[PDB]
Amino acid sequence: DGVGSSSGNWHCDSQWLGDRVITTSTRTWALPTYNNHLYKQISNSTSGGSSNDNAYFGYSTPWGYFDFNRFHCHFSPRDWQRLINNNWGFRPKRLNFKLFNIQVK
Amino acid sequence: SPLMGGFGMKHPPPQILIKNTPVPADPPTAFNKDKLNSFITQYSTGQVSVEIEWELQKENSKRWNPEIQYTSNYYKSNNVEFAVNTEGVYSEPRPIGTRYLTRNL
């Protein structure tokens, strides 16, 4: 939209329906410049590794990534307690993801 | 509110009164005006069913840390709490209240 208008609101809550629970979590993030905008070949030689079992070859990218693959990223301790004390099972169904209020310094 | 605990009502559930109808024994062959005092020894048995619908007030707390909950103790014991003994005697090992969840004042 514009410089002076927020592009999203803070949504962080849990909604408990009959057979469904909807968890929403919002966090503030910071993203630096990685590898000074470069791709770099990496290996156990570059990191000083010696053992065969820990040898590797790969690349480090200037990109970051968002990870929310831990349960506490979505469930508060009270919500987790409710889930574990009141249900025989659970599974994820669908996902909604948002990035907003971008600020570059 | 009843001082021993519970719900006070001007019109509570009505008293349900039951009695075995007296069955006189053999009366004398000559009329006697006195009330009969010789009856057949009797008793009755049967089944009784009561169904009560309860309305619930769900909790909508925003508390972050887990609540206190009533729970059985996993530690080994000779008998299971709220179960029968080896002689078939059912027992209630402790009084259980209702106030474990929390809310602000």
- Angstroms from A50 CA to nearest CA on chain B: 46
Asked if A78 and B66 come within 8 Å (Cβ–Cβ), the reply is: yes
The residues, ordered by sequence, that sit 6+ positions from A80 with a Cβ below 8 Å of its Cβ are A71, A72, B66
Cβ–Cβ under 8 Å, residues B64 and A76:
yes
The dihedrals phi and psi of A80, each to the nearest 5 degrees, come to: -60, -40
User: Cα-Cα-Cα-Cα dihedral of A44, A47, A51, A52, to 10°?
Assistant: -10
One-letter amino acid at B96 equals I
At B5, list the tokens. Answer: 């605990």
At B103, list the tokens. Answer: 């809310």
* Distance in angstroms between the alpha carbons of the first and the last residue of chain B: 20
Chain B residues whose beta carbon lies within 8 Å of the beta carbon of residue A81: 66-67, 69
Which parts of chain A are beta strand (E)? 13-16, 21-24, 40-43, 57-60
Residue of B58, B60, B64, B103 to mutate for A, most A C-beta atoms under 10 A: B64
Give the method used. cryo-EM
d(CA B7, CA B98): 14
